[PDB]
Amino acid sequence: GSGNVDLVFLFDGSMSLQPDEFQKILDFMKDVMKKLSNTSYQFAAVQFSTSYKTEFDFSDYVKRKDPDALLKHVKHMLLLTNTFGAINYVATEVFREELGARPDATKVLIIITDGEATDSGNIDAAKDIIRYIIGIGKHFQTKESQETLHKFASKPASEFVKILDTFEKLKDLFTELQKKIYVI
Ligand SMILES: CC[C@H](C)C(=O)O[C@H]1C[C@@H](C)C=C2C=C[C@H](C)[C@H](CC[C@@H]3C[C@@H](O)CC(=O)O3)[C@H]21
Numbered sequence: 001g002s003g004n005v006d007l008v009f010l011f012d013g014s015m016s017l018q019p020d021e022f023q024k025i026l027d028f029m030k031d032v033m034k035k036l037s038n039t040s041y042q043f044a045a046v047q048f049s050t051s052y053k054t055e056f057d058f059s060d061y062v063k064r065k066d067p068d069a070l071l072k073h074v075k076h077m078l079l080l081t082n083t084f085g086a087i088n089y090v091a092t093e094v095f096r097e098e099l100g101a102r103p104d105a106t107k108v109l110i111i112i113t114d115g116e117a118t119d120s121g122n123i124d125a126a127k128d129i130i131r132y133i134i135g136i137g138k139h140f141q142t143k144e145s146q147e148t149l150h151k152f153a154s155k156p157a158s159e160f161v162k163i164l165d166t167f168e169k170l171k172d173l174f175t176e177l178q179k180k181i182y183v184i
């Protein structure tokens, strides 16, 4: 339709993440934004743990644009992993016209986490958002834990759930993303 994509990074700041691992999440987000600067994509980023913080809104991105400056002042929260609550927060408190969301854009949520959710609920309010979940590291070693992530993602899980055994594999994920960039 409009050809516009409003994309939110929803990233884990729980106590499980070591300092260097948290930085690699931030570096990955910055790589994606830099590669897609000056396009029809708009970005916002939200850190979640026990509660949620909008690190920058869509309007901040449009005004400042520099991914380095925009994520420079992120404080690691180091609490729990309330992923149900975080998704509902994005759907009702971030995707809003008064915060710079474009009303007819395609909405996309990229969830990066290194643990199973410590809450529960439903995400019906977020169901018109395209949802990718990237699950990283040892807490997703087993098949049963990988499957807990299906609930958050759009369907099929085979396209929308990405499991990475280490944080260094975020770089491989960015290599694969770039092979899919086209001028249309
Ligand atoms: C696309 C390949 C990479 C690895 C990936 O999954 O990136 C996904 C997940 C993550 C790595 C980053 C993304 C950044 C931008 C877009 C939204 C991308 C998904 C792209 C697809 C493209 C078509 O299938 C239509 C659509 O709506 O989503 C995601």
Ligand SMILES: [Mg+2]
Binding pocket: 012, 014, 016, 080, 081, 113, 114, 115, 116
């Ligand atoms: Mg966690």
